[PDB]
Design a protein around this ligand. Structure first.
Ligand SMILES: [Mg+2]
Ligand SMILES: [Mg+2]
Ligand SMILES: [Mg+2]
Length: 116
RNA sequence: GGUGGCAGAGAAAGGCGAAAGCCUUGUGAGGCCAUC
């Protein structure tokens, strides 16, 4: 149900980046708080898992991100996404709120996301 | 308890059970507010 294919090296970079931002910035795990952050203009980068069932849970997020000028990327499993964020290791979506020390790796990854 | 609104937790909570253990929880546990 993805809107564009994300190659594995980008998914790997996105998740490694989320692990680092966890340490010095601010992350939100879960679709209700991810959606809220997007709507409030506070999300820097949104992660959407591809194995979300029922898929309607995350179906509105890509469009809302585009309307809010928020870049978003898909990753393979909500388990990988949850583990990268920490805490309870499952999440259908997540958002970076504060970039911490990773502004340059994030901007470089979003450049690649637009390239797709 | 119903409805509406917050917030965000797994070395974690609440539910059921004599017990074994099971159920539910970032797909939102406990909690808070308003309202019926
Ligand atoms: Mg009810
Ligand atoms: Mg309800
Ligand atoms: Mg509600």
């Amino acid at each position: 149900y993805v809107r564009f294919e994300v190659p594995e090296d980008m998914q790997n970079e996105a998740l490694s980046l989320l692990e680092k931002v966890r340490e010095s910035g601010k992350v939100k795990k879960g679709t209700n708080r991810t959606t809220h952050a997007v709507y409030r203009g506070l999300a820097k980068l949104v992660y959407i898992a591809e194995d979300v069932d029922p898929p309607e849970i995350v179906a509105h997020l890509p469009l809302l991100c585009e309307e809010k000028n928020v870049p978003y990327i898909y990753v393979k499993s909500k388990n990988d996404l949850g583990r990268a964020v920490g805490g309870w290791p499952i999440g259908a979506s997540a958002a970076i709120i504060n970039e911490g020390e990773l502004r340059k790796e994030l901007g470089s990854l979003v450049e690649k996301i637009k390239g797709l």
